[model samples]
Target chain A: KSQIPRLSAINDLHKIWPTVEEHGAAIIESFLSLDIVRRLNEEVDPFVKIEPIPAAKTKDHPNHVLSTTTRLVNVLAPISKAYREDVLNSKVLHRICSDAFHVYGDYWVLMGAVMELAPSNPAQPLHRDMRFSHPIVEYLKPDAPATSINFLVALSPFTAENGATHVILGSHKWQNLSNVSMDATVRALMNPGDALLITDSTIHCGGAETTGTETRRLLTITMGISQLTPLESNLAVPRPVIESLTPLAQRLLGWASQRSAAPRDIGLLTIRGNSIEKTMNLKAEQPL
Target chain B: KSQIPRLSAINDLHKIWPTVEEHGAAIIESFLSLDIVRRLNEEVDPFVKIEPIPAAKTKDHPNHVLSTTTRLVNVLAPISKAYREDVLNSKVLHRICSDAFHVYGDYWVLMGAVMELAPSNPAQPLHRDMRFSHPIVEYLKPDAPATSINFLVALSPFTAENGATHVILGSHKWQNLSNVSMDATVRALMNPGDALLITDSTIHCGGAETTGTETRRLLTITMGISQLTPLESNLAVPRPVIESLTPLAQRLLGWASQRSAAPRDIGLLTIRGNSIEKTMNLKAEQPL
Candidate 1:
């Protein structure tokens, strides 16, 4: 019955998180301060400057053609200093994610990508960010602990006219998304520098940029508990780039290696499908 | 959202079980016929005639010394032909149990006991029947299939004044039984020939016999999925007694070989903690 919560980003996140957990998403106004926002923009500009082709443009075009209307800037943690320090190191955000994801050991950056929606771009098909962690999270109860959490930091103005993200509220508890349609959705209306902290269980997508000429820039940082296989491999950022991050941040980016919580060798950094740690004296990657 | 249902014994059991599954328990009035109930009483009377001391009497008694006030007749299948034929081989009961427990391969009679509560007897503590199958079924969603199923057929009159079964209504879907108390409990009042089919997830216990001299007789037949370990081992009954049963009933009583859903030998029929099947070519015990 309650509307999506809009709270101050600096508020005690532990208290504010319950609303986000209940509603599946909440708006943390000014999640990125103006100073950090400017620094982040300048830090990310060089990598995202090239015009990349998006799949949507291909879908829109006839005869299997591709066009330059893309909105992707992948692997932000490696290149963007503002991303590693300002966003990932945010104490409040980390606390909420840690508490929510304690069951899986801890939370880590599964993937991070910066996107700028071109004017009049197509809307993303509505789906859950938790889709990647399929069998691990088949169905979630209303009061069940979340499998993962994500944040969409607005690098530019986010509005209904400029693709501010769309979410199906309370769909976190819904057993079947097939029964869900877009009729019950709500658009997240936020100013530039704000962030939408959304649980992975909720149904959501990037809204279409209705206004011609106004671009909507968003930095999507998706996290999973330590147990899940990372959606995007940390291999995208080589060791040189990884070395710049703090130890926790490096581990978050899947730098060394990880395993299941059961002390089983069922997870990553396996060579020939055996324990890489036991084979060598290795135990995840390191900067030292 | 709905009240506990009371349906006929033969009212399309597959359709009728959803209520029992939803509410954790249901009353199927006239579940046993006058002829069968009479036969079952005659079959079990001798075994239950002795004054067996129940633990509740010990709790009421200050000293650890036991007394002559018990109502238990353990190992029903070996002694009672009526129990195996009338209760065990009931087509409708088997159909519902089969469909509900199909996930575990098939259902088996975990334990069967006949009880007669004397006047002024203490009430059995309210708890889940699935408590025996603990970690195998830590938490189940409201819609999740029950880990086990149980039936309490009244061989003699089951009245509120003379100890009808009491259940925490809809406690089958309850996440924490600790959050529950006696205030939410509902009693299953039935006739001499009626039955109470309760899901294993529901919290329930036998009610105290409050009437001056009336005794309450009940036949409890608890079942588990093929995957779970049976609460009572089949060794209670000798091979000679087991030889009288049909193949399905024999397997139901845990007579022959059984394993987990997986081919791995994690389940019973283990001797000295190793595969008895492979070790000796001795599949489970057989009459043949």
Candidate 2:
């Protein structure tokens, strides 16, 4: 019903290339601004990072944990209105998602949660956002018809040398590229407020915060298909609360409640047998 | 969408119409037909009804044992598919499912799964379904919404005089009704293929079975939203056989693969209150 940019070809996956390309990585600048922070009064705090030690013990031993200093608005702001109404709901993102092998639901987006890879944060093992989980890979597998589009809107500055988000160009089409260890990938340097839309499953990482005037502040937002789980894992709102939400919020949350009709090739089969099931147990690389 | 009778309206809970009005319960004929026997084939074959004897050491001394029979199908075939399907897909049915209460999903039919008491089998106190261990009064609590739509489909001819399925019409809406002893409910008489849909909150029983040449038979197929745990404790299908089914079949079997949406209310508040902490107690009622 609405008109928006449609990236129907791999060529298009490359066109908005500048949005994600340019620098050691490129910049979209100020896509998210200070006004949003003012309106939401959100916080960005990262939990301290811990390094791996071999043969961790139990009972006396404690588990190491880290988290981003961030918060979700939960409620929507007008600053995000275009992203929801024009960009997400538009057929363009939908088509690009399909072309990019994000074959799953209709649309996808993360909450505007704060992103901070803070001070005292040890370097995270280099890994692309696309490399962490199974469902995402299953949804984004190139062999399958595409189901989503991938783009990151910069709330804060991202750059090559700074802890800007990293990228490996054209990796989405390469098999086993996302499966590599941190040593195996290239990093993208992006800037605050700039949006980077990438083609391929380029393995990327968030550069470490060496010395910064700021605390590697950035709002990392990715949009894909609806079949993927929401980043916040908050789908069912209480009925009374749901009744009070704007229609736009309701659509974002309620659009894909029905079971998809595309019959699964094999039903009830264990994931261990599926092609997506990888034996590289993260437990071996990291502690359980 | 392809046309079919949409059974959504039946699950509307605010309307408290009597079950009889909901399905015109009186229109059904009472019978212990051959049909009911045939459908309850597996259950009747090793037909055993539990018997309780007073124990010397326990306050609730009495314990029950079963009397088994091999020819249940002979007791269940007369019940008709039309009778069961109507109630299974009924809106009233879906509303009461413990999970997926009215959200779109598949449905599973449970035929020939109910406990009964009657003169034909010998005198016995009425008991709830196999899985309910609590006292009927406690089981019929005020806050626990009726979570199932159970249909009593008669096979052979049945009559109130011959220990037919009982019905205390409009009984479910009353919280205090559970205080009434099970003996007080009115008996329901019905013929072959006739169905009477009852909720768990209702108090009903099998009438005194007249010592006759024929055995009384009824197949209670409870229809529920697909993801809910089914009332039928066992269906006799082997585990491996069940595991190989389609997603719908796996869902029907209550296997590991099928899942429902998270509940509306989340109690996870802190580290001490989260699911991980609660699981240490290993409580059966705790939904993991």
Candidate 3:
């Protein structure tokens, strides 16, 4: 039997598809090993930067502290390469991406970021990860396909007492902030190693910690259509750093090809613009 | 050949399903008879009341005249009962609504209102009809279903000059107001007797009248899940008036049944806190 615990829906990708379709999100219990969760929580600790959430962003709770990383893969590589590989090669993730985006070559994991919340922190502002498109309400119309998907893996015990993620149930269908009802929100109470899968269009936020002393940790992996711009550029990193990564890791970080290229293809060199004739002449002259 | 003109999607309910699913709304050309439109407009004309739209409500233009009615059915009944019957028993309206709402008993016409705009009237506030639920941003999730549907029928020729309804293209899936791109809106230009079908979650507004001097006339019918509260109450009308309507019309107005009931057959007389058994003796004494 599989060790994966079915939180709500049971069975394989086919079964999980309905739940994801209905709620725009789902929770998978114990998706990662506790050892991996422990390493990830600690490894990203050094680079964590805290920022204050503005009051205008979220009306209920504002001025909250949310810690995140600028370079996620760079931090993860030093901790556990195997964990990074598991996330990148997840069959379930790929299948969902294929279903949401339709065409295979248009989808890929965009970037990774870790979110850390401390005691006394208020809730973070509610938002959608993929904002390049319209609100979730329009997409909820008949047969509208999804633009992006999200994965949030728990690195610590997530509970109501310790500020678990607060999400508005069926909020993706709403038209504006006024549409969200008071008691409509649900908390994703997860133990260490659990993971939550969410659609990019759903309304959600990081919950506030009321009484917990320990910090809450979560790893957020954003996946979206390939044609859109990325948050981080692998080319910006040092040459030796890019070479040190495994080939698969290099691809995940977007170092393998131009962002405009299709998912399957890897481009090394290309010529374009008015210099095309010059490139052709140079190629002919250097043919020795 | 079919009589229904294709304003956007070309086909019957089955074909319109995809367009409604994609954009949250569509238009049907020549949905009603000119005779019926003329009768309905004249019948409800006396009860028509004009009021200026508040400046705060619509930011773009203020002090614009908007004609409305407190009681739509009551106002329409005095002129033509046959016209009311045609609207109440519309096959196309029922079919499209049934497909959008899914379950049969879950859907019904919640209320009806008439909007009349004249030259110089600015656009009404941009919004959705079923906002008692949630904003469109929350619904764009992977598989969000529609909670309500709306019908806007033209009583006169609708054109850009006279200020037809302006709707944001694919706005049903937008994340919020900020997601509505400039120049994305389109005018629902229509002829007399045409109808616009809209999902309750879509963002729309009555457009500003700029060029034409003729008053723009429209009959707005709002439908939604039966379990949700309606804008107008059938009980508010006199009992004799309710009894005068056809059985089908009475049901549509919500006089046929209760909105909700607790489980089991615990209806009829029930025991009270102070007098637990007094009703039993009173019933026994009164029995023949």
In TM-score terms, which candidate is top? 1
TM-score of each: 0.45, 0.37, 0.41
Please tell me which model should have the higher DockQ, number 1 or number 3.
3
- The C-alpha RMSD of each candidate to the native structure, in angstroms, is 16.9, 22.2, 23.8
Tens digits of per-residue lDDT for model 2, A1-288: 121122322244444433332221233333334454333223222111222221123211111222333222221222243333333343444444444432232343533233445543445544444322212233222444323234555555555445655555444455665446554445444444445555324455556656645555544445544433333322222334433333434434432121222222110101111111111110111111
Find the candidate with the highest lDDT and give its number: 1
Better of 1 and 2 by lDDT: 1
Tens-digit lDDT string for candidate 2 (B1-288): 111111222243433223333432332332223443454433343432432212212212111232222112211112223223233234433443433233323345433343433335543344433232111113223533333456666655667556676555555555554455644555555656555656555555556666654466565665543323232322223334433343333333332222222221111111111222222221221111
Worst 10 residues of 2 chain B by lDDT: B264-273
Give each candidate's interface RMSD in Å: 21.2, 20.5, 27.1
Which ten-residue region of model 1 chain B has the weakest summed lDDT?
Answer: B58-67
**Candidate 2 segments exceeding 4 Å error:** A1-14, A17-30, A37-105, A110-112, A130-142, A145-151, A176-189, A198-200, A235-241, A244-248, A255-288, B1-288
lDDT of 3 by residue, A1-288 (tens): 111224532246655545666776678766666776776666666655423232224222221222321112222433444445555656666666666655323454454656666676777677765432222223344444454577788888888887787677665555566866425677788888777777766778777788857687788776665432233323223334544554445545543422222232211111111111222221211111
Candidate 1 structure quality by residue, lDDT tens digits, B4-52? 5788777656665777766777887787788988888898887677534
C-alpha DockQ of every model? 0.01, 0.02, 0.02
Specify the CAPRI tier of model 2. Answer: incorrect
Residue-level error in angstroms, candidate 3, position B44: 0.5
lDDT of each: 0.63, 0.37, 0.53
